[PDB]
Amino acid sequence: GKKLLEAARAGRDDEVRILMANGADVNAADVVGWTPLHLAAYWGHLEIVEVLLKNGADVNAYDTLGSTPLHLAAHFGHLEIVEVLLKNGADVNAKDDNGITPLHLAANRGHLEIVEVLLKYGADVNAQDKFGKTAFDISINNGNEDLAEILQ
Amino acid sequence: GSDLGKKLLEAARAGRDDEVRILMANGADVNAADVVGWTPLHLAAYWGHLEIVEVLLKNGADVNAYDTLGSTPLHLAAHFGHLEIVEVLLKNGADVNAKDDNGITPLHLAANRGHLEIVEVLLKYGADVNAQDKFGKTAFDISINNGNEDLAEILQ
Amino acid sequence: PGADAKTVQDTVTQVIEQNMNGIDNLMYMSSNSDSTGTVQITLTFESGTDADIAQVQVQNKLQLAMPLLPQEVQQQGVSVEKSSSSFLMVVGVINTDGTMTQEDISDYVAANMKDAISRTSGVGDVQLFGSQYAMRIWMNPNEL
Amino acid sequence: PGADAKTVQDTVTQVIEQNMNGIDNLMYMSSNSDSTGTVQITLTFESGTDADIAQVQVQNKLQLAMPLLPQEVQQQGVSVEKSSSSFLMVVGVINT
Amino acid sequence: EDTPQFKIDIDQEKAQALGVSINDINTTLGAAWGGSYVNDFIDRGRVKKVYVMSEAKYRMLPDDIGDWYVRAADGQMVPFSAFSSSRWEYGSPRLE
Amino acid sequence: LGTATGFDFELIDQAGLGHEKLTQARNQLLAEAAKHPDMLTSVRPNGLEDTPQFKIDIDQEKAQALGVSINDINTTLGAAWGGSYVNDFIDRGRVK
Amino acid sequence: RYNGLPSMEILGQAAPGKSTGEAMELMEQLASKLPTGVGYDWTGMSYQERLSGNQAPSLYAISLIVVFLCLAALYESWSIPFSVMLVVPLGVIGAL
Amino acid sequence: LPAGATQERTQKVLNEVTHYYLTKEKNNVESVFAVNGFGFAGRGQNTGIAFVSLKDWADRPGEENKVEAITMRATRAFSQIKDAMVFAFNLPAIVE
Amino acid sequence: NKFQLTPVDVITAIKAQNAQVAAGQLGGTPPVKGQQLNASIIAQTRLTSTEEFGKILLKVNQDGSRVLLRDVAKIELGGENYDIIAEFNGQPASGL
Amino acid sequence: STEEFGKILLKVNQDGSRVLLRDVAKIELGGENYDIIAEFNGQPASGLGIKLATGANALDTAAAIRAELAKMEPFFPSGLKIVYPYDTTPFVKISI
């Protein structure tokens, strides 16, 4: 499992199936609660996200602060991974311990295509975080006029 | 200021016993005081020269001489933890409850430095345990403020 | 103290580096900024460079950067040394009666031995393997 | 200004002394701190040492200890000088 | 190699609203979790440092963050969880 | 070159003894030197002897209770009695 | 302070008829009986005196040897140099 | 060790290294001075160094008892320590 | 003037919101023995773009409305100074 | 001392009771940092890692280090002993 967490982070897509062929825990978690799916999402390893899901990896696994792989892919602008995760049933409205949603994170970093896909899969635009801010509030604050209009 | 008076202030401070002996035979003022009002007894007490304390006391030293801020030799001896000097001064009539200009007593000073035996000696000679300095503090207050449990127990 | 690598780099390393110019015989410059809060900038000179002058020139530029450094960095002391990178020797200190802890020995060494070894001619740098004592105030958030 | 000897020693003299490292050809160092608010630290070097290098090495170690000194001492400044030099003459200026 | 780091965002607006200064917030976070060199003292005649820091048991776990309080202008104790949010990310422990 | 007569001797506090204990040790050595007039003459300190000084204790509690800050107290005492270098002015074109 | 430690400087000289080196050796002996943790060191003239005194013999011998070698070359003889070298006391006695 | 590793885990690896020298190189190594938290890299939790001293050359007869053979064996033994990079090396003739 | 702000308020907000904070560690030394996690705490970092400087918060109104830096100023990359302008054969240029 | 630091008066409650520093913190003498821990053959140690100044003679600097240590040893606390775990110097002298 530790080898899988490492293989996942490195993008060694080959090593990943070899270990899973030897039955490594697909939901193996590291010290901050990140699974192999968390790490692939983070470093943009599409192939490994795909292989992990097909081997029953928990698509809604969360880390010790409530953040999910969809949070990570959305925040870091990995469009394809966001799509894959949503297809495999990722909670589009998942909240981390701060009440921050994938939509919040995508909005904050101006990931327009990602916001659209999230909206498509039914992300709640009214969702507030712990400070009562929505994706819309963020767009206005950031001066993103493109995004601000998409949130209408 | 005396010729021999000054010599005596120095000898007592330095604990030059034999010199003090000669000075006594010659009539050196035991009541000599420097600018801040310290006598040889003050000096001997401060620096802890026991024999000189005894010699000075045999020779008519004021046991209760106070300096310009009202401190006595018992204050100094208590404060710097010279137990045997404390005992000697008390036996020779030192005011166990002498207050300096700050309302500070020998018990205050000894407690503040954690000198348990001296505190005991002073209590034995009738140190007023309830005496307060200019700030309303007792030796007991000092003890618990200093976090000295043993001392506190002593003063109840 | 307490700084991550990026904070060290962007607040100290980069500032000092940008002040390293007009230094004679410089072949190259390298640095590390780590999450210990530590930065080390190494300037390497052509063979035959007077090491005294090299140090003087490096510090003349460093003092232009000093006021631009965070106060907490200035107060830890910045230093400039001219040494070999490898150790000449390690002087070890133990207690054979086992009546002193590691912490104890380290404070003793730091407090009584290290300065005079540091002032000895030929001694470029001294690393203490341990720490000098400090007054440690360990705060409790509940009581606070 | 206005400092007793112990104040000078414990906030100025010791700090500077602890920073006098990595200086070449030093024989010994000595200091006094007094109640006129003054400290002097003399470093004496091996015969044959270049006095200029010695001074600049001392002053550069000092320069890096300045942030550790009290404000008012930084304000007054701290001088580094060759002191083993003597007077050619002394010109007195009086008013009669 | 990069490692996990604990990223915490101070919400400027929330802080302003509660009347807790950002300086208090940063000193509070930094002193507790990082340690702060306050000033010097004398230990057996040698000048040495004074460090303030959280006791170990209160700076080991991420949830500990919210156990620290800052005093607002109105004198109310405000926990870190009221004006901040955090997330895991990766960063470098040694930048070259 | 300086005096260059007799010897120049340094007595050193090698542990944590402190000023008073080092004075006692000095006095001890000076007394023993004096017992050998046949070999040693004029063995004496080059420095100064302790003198009366005026210790004033600020009571923190009473100050806090009166609403008097320590900085004000200490700056009042030191500026008034010790004097304080505020800043510079220009006197006929020279900074002073 | 001396070499970073609390210190006290002591001056003195050798009694009439005695050498300073002898007076130093006694001072070292009395010094060895001082309370635990009190050390000492020689500085200034005494520092110069010591390291200067350890050369003299080697320098006088080198002089002696070279004078003899020159004379032996001059006279083509290992023994005749002696007849010249014997004159040294003849002038030195007058000086004394 | 990898960044993120604790001082405790670094100590564990250090013990294995110290152990190896104390038991498997009894004939060759005189002493081990091991340091947790210091490496060439920098004062980290995840780093350490061991300074090894060997018995005199005369007591280490043969190529198998010289530093090159000792460090190969050591580095191979340590190759099996998990999640740490550990290796012994002879410093080159001239480092540089 | 319209928001009752001054350059002093603007400077304060930039110092506060364009900060790079040392924030310490989770599981840093000395730890509670048994600690698995050691991670840097990352708090404020320097702003990197005109957009970030623009959304610096100067104040919220009585009304809850926000006043950002872009509401009282233009934000853009531009020279530290605008004193030097060079041309090469009449064409805009820079140089060393 | 820890005692003096403990009785630092943080504040006086309205009921007059005192809040002392020892009430919100543990006070102890402890390291400036807690990152570097050393052993010598498995027992507690400290030490000095010494690097040679640029161009300085290794054999000469080592001798000078030895002479300085010799001055310290007579004043050690009981049980304290210098050990010599790693020296590059003997090999220079010996091989020559």
Author numbering:
A (entry chain E): 15 to 166
B (entry chain D): 11 to 166
C (entry chain A): 50 to 193
D (entry chain B): 50 to 145
E (entry chain A): 722 to 817
F (entry chain B): 674 to 769
G (entry chain B): 818 to 913
H (entry chain A): 578 to 673
What does the paper say about this structure?
The AcrA-AcrB-TolC complex is a secondary active antiport system in Escherichia coli, powered by the electrochemical proton gradient across the inner membrane of this Gram-negative bacterium. Its biological function is to capture cytotoxic compounds from either the periplasmic space or the inner membrane, and to expel them across the outer membrane, into the extracellular medium. AcrB is the inner-membrane component of the system, and is responsible for both substrate recognition and energy transduction. The asymmetric trimer structures indicate that this domain also cycles between three distinct conformations, and point to several ionizable residues in its core (D407, D408, K940 and R971) that might function as a proton-relay network.
To further assess the proposed proton-relay mechanism and its influence on the conformation of the TM domain, we solved the atomic structures of four AcrB variants, namely K940A, R971A, D407N and D408N, all of which abolish the drug-efflux activity of AcrB. Electrostatic calculations for the R971A and D407N crystal structures indicate that, like K940A and D408N, these variants lack the ability to bind and release two protons. In D407N, like in D408N, only one proton is loaded (on D408), and only in the O state. The R971A and D407N substitutions, however, not only perturb the energetics of the conformational cycle and the transduction of the proton electrochemical gradient, but also seem to preclude the protomers from adopting all the native-like conformations, particularly the T state. The effect of the D407N substitution is subtler than that of R971A, but also underscores the relationship between the local configuration of the proton-relay network and the organization of the transmembrane repeats. The D407N structure shows that although the substituted asparagine can accept a hydrogen-bond from K940 in the L and T states, its orientation is geometrically inconsistent with the second hydrogen-bond with T978 seen in the wildtype. In the L state this appears to be compensated by an alternative hydrogen-bond donated by N941, but this interaction is not feasible in the T state. In addition, the asparagine substitution removes the attractive electrostatic interaction between D407 with R971. In sum, the interaction network at the R1-R2 interface is partially disengaged. Consequently, the T state in the D407N structure shows R1 and R2 partially displaced, in a conformation that is again intermediate between the wildtype T and O states.
